[PDB]
Amino acid sequence: HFDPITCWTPAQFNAQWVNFVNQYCFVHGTYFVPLDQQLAFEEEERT
Amino acid sequence: AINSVNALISRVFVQPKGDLADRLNSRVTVVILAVSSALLLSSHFDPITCWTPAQFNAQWVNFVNQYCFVHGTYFVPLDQQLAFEEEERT
Amino acid sequence: AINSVNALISRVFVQPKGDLADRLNSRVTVVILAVSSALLLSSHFDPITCWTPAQFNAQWVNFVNQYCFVHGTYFVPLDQQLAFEEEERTKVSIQYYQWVPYVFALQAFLFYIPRFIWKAMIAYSGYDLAAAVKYVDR
Amino acid sequence: IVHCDFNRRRPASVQLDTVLCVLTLNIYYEKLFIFLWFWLVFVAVVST
Amino acid sequence: IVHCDFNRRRPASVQLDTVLCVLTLNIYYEKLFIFLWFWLVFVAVVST
Amino acid sequence: IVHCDFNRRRPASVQLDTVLCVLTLNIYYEKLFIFLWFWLVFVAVVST
């Protein structure tokens, strides 16, 4: 659309991490959960 | 800080007159419980410190510290998540 | 800071009356252990300082300092990496802070007991020395 | 080491969260409670 | 000089890490423990 | 002018709140929808 994906990161990242974690999120996988299940644990119910 | 008060000790610790055996344990008792009673509410003059996330401006930290100290607190061994509702958490 | 209390020393250090040889070592004992017991929990009034990485806002530093001081600590000689799990990391484990400052208070207390035993017991005998000592003395 | 609970109020109501606190006192209180316990129950048995 | 261990809690659970701390006290405690040790065990042998 | 809804996730779960947003588009869409409506239904009646 020349903002591929935007992310939420907590507040102490100096904004040169934001411009990182944005990409890193965009390459390494992502996933979904409907919301309020917590995450459980391990990889199973989360991913 | 550092402070030590002798005369308050010597006063009741001695001045009331009797040698009565092992009834003076009422005396020495009152001493210990009195002192520790005070020195604890002395707040070691940092009652409790807390972790708050990073955008609080430090006049909230000096709040959330107290607020934590008054409204209840609790414990969990660590890694259970928290579950939910009030049950397994509190 | 700097502070020195003499009268607390002189009080027990002298005022209880006896010259009894090498039993006064119970006295001087109670002194040493008492003092060091206190001056250690004085926190040199900087108990422990820690390294935390750079984005903590300094109200975490004043946290992680304590949190380190309570939850355990440990040691490794340096360069082993850490390995993993809990095994090779936490093998060499040093926390005595939960012990020293208080266990000394207990110490001094247990050196001062035996006197109290003595005065109580010799009082059981019904025949007091101390009166006699002062009397014939002066 | 505890997990403290905390509130705000906004148009969304309870709006609560947790922050884990270090706890210093609890090192005192359960340093002494032992001692004070021995010493009391002593004072009882010798006083009966 | 020690390596302290530390935790947070986020949706990812234990979330732990290490920070190496300098340790001042340990210079005291193992300055005195020697002395205090001599002096006690003395007090024993002279008191037996 | 609307009241938007919003979430986070912390150990306390839904953790939601509201923030009121200005809305620009809605000035467009209900500027044109009128016009476009006349013009369509016209195109119908003339096309039947």
Numbering used by the authors:
A (entry chain L): 50 to 51, 54 to 98
B (entry chain G): 7 to 51, 54 to 98
C (entry chain F): 7 to 51, 54 to 146
D (entry chain G), E (entry chain F), F (entry chain K): 245 to 292
Text taken from the publication that reported this structure:
Invertebrates possess a different gap junction protein family, termed innexins, that is essential for eating and developmental functions in Caenorhabditis elegans and for electrical synapses in Drosophila7.
The inner and outer lobes of E1 straddle the E2 β-hairpin stacks whereby the E2 β-hairpins serve as a wall to prevent from leakage of permeates to the extracellular space. The pore pathway has a high positive potential and is constricted at two sites for each hemichannel (four per junction channel).
